[model samples]
Target: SSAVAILETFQKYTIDQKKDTAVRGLARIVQVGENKTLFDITVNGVPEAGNYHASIHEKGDVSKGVESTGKVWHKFDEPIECFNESDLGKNLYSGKTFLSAPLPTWQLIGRSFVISKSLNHPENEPSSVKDYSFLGVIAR
Candidate 1:
């Protein structure tokens, strides 16, 4: 199928007390012929290795980052942590995990996914703040 959508990082991510704006990522959500939704989340930069959990929400607003990206509309059942290196000696790293969603593309577009440090959250609830969480709006 040709149906697809994208989820990429926000402009900035605040980890601990440090504000970072250099991290970049892109998670392409494509609807394959055999699945409901194919999630290919790729993070090109990680300040340090992070145990990030990917979760999509009902809202697509990122005007305020995590404070207003809304709650857990849907989420991956597992964690997608970072691996190693782009700027090798500099110690930077990257990550991605392709998974399946039971929902259709039309229902996923216009929503958002926030790859945050916190994990294991129930549906219809706000994500608990940890650090270095990035919000990416779904669809085009």
Candidate 2:
């Protein structure tokens, strides 16, 4: 239906592609943690897909220029229509899809950096099946 087409078009992703997706909506962080070191602690993603459901998987190969140690973040389900107004949502308006969220402030989640979501999440706990107006991104 329209929602599927809208999501597929905006996300530049099809159920047929059948692979992981990159996350979108992050702030530029050249360095993080004390000393501003740039080696191991790197910024990767910040989840801001509105009410959409997605997963973060392993990239699996750095040799291909893809971040190996970083997670392969993708929409866990179809994307919901929402206005993001930030640079992260510009790609869709700029006539491109398949866009990924840029790396934002690094959050320490154990040994890995992550954009997290948990129960009692601020916005009534959106799910993949519902429609939301705006995606709230609270950066670190």
Candidate 3:
């Protein structure tokens, strides 16, 4: 149950990270790009990965996203989750990658906003990460 453990660890860090923080946020995954090769990251803008996490899902929405440095040219009608073990989150968490923009539509982009993968139905059954991915972003 690595995923569960990971979530627990993440929560612990998240809590500690906000110990003296002004605003508290949620942990969630955000979709930066669509189908693309790990080696090939010409989707967003950043050539190499950075601090970002993602999850892929069959059904999700991304119609609304927060604005950041760049503007969202377009977004998916539905939310898009990051693929577990996919090239997205892998780099984000590992600090190996990053999206060109902050997140087009955080509403649909980030998944598992509250309930973490560990607390979810599955217990660390690492699928493709896309199976049922979610992110812990700023709580609305």
Candidate 4:
């Protein structure tokens, strides 16, 4: 069996409206060969339109949403951002991707999986971070 991760809108503020935090999705990280893992990511819907970068964070404390999830512990080679406003209006911002890495799922059990508009590299501070972010915890 594979581990699963849920994705919900990042509730950055103390009081965030559903309109801003309605994003939904799920992820599956499975151990394949010796040390390889297959990652399946799904985005059910998004309130905003943009490419999303998925990553695993260091912690699972999501009480404050993505902010509390902590920093990036793993980065995928893919950003899942190939599409932009293409059919966002007609379609409900649904997307999927199957990415794999040379790693084990055992160590990611309590980490947070995040989908962010931008990679939000350390270069930018609080002001430039992506407001539209989603996260879920990796569960075995």
Candidate 5:
């Protein structure tokens, strides 16, 4: 298969200072071809024993705070885990997904990508601001 790399980016994980662990790592997105893309998400220092939610949202703002109202662009097929035996304190996860729409129309630039808290964590009700494990924008 022939494909071209459109855009490539790397972002570090950001967490809430008061309620979440010091999660750190990088996320990479590569446009393979057309509307198909490859995503590489890796993290360390995350709380073990649960799966986290990873998705692309419509807005790219972490100033006020991370919210769930931006709308979901793409969500990981499976949840992510944060634990590695070799590294002992780091975890790496990756996946690929097709955008619901195409480039420009669904351009990631100026938009937000987030790795939310685990679905099994029973601390926040209705919604959790701590849900955002990592929130960042996709830039050129």
Candidate 6:
């Protein structure tokens, strides 16, 4: 077997808060191989700082809600942080995780991508007002 059979993916998104200020930014999701993916997200103008959760939803829409119970198709195993740098203004995070399966098998296209207000979620658990920055479907 050869190691060159990997399937690569590249997706970009403009993440935005559903019911808040002009908080928004660009995010990138890339598949490095058959069993791993990388998430690089950068956003600014948000005044919050802490650990947040991220996930992929079962639908290409987020008009329903931002909970990660049944709508979650795949959850990243780690948390992303915001405003944790010395600059105190740059909110950027990146992580690479091993997928249980390949990206093509996962069929990530037309599926919702979400980032939570806190680390409280099933996307990777507890809280009220789980505001989300929803990017419906992984776009190119």
Q: Evaluated with TM-score, which candidate comes out highest?
A: 4
What is the per-residue lDDT of model 6 for residues 1-140, given as tens digits with 9 covering 90 to 100?
11111111111113222234333444466666775555556544433455556677776544444443247788876666664443333444333233222464246655666665533242322234445443435664
lDDT of 4 by residue, 82-102 (tens): 343334444445678898878
Q: Candidate 3 on 1-140: residue-level lDDT in tens?
A: 00110111122222122233222212223444553212111112111222233332223222221211123233323222223232343232212222233343433332322211222323354332312212223222
Write candidate 1's Cα lDDT for 1-140 as tens digits. Answer: 32333434444434212234433567777777454888887876565676777888778787777667777888787888786666565466678888788877777777777776642332223334345666677764
How far is 102's C-alpha from truth in model 3 (Å)? 8.1
Error of 1 at 138 (Å): 1.0
Ranking the candidates on lDDT from highest down gives 4, 1, 5, 6, 2, 3
Candidate-wise lDDT, in order = 0.65, 0.26, 0.25, 0.72, 0.49, 0.46
In model 6, the Cα lDDT at residue 114 comes to 64
Q: What TM-score, over all chains together, does every model reach? A: 0.74, 0.20, 0.19, 0.76, 0.58, 0.55
Local lDDT at 65 for model 4? 82
Clashes of each: 0, 6, 40, 0, 0, 1
Model 2, range 1-140, lDDT digits (tens) per residue? 00000011112222113224344322222333342312221112223323333333344222322223255343333332333433343222111113232332243111222222232243443444122111112222
| Residue 25 lDDT (model 3) | 19
Candidate 1 vs candidate 2: the TM-score winner is 1
RMSD, each candidate, Å?
5.9, 14.4, 14.4, 4.8, 6.9, 8.9
Point out where model 5 deviates above 4 Å. Answer: 1-23, 85-106, 119-132
The window of 10 residues in a row where model 6 has the poorest summed lDDT is: 1-10
lDDT of 6: 0.46
- What is the lDDT, from 0 to 100, of the residue 85 in candidate 3? 30
Question: With candidate 1 superimposed using the best TM-score fit, by how many Å does residue 117's alpha carbon deviate from the native?
Answer: 1.4
Clashing pairs in 4: none
Tell me which of candidates 2 and 6 scores higher on lDDT: 6
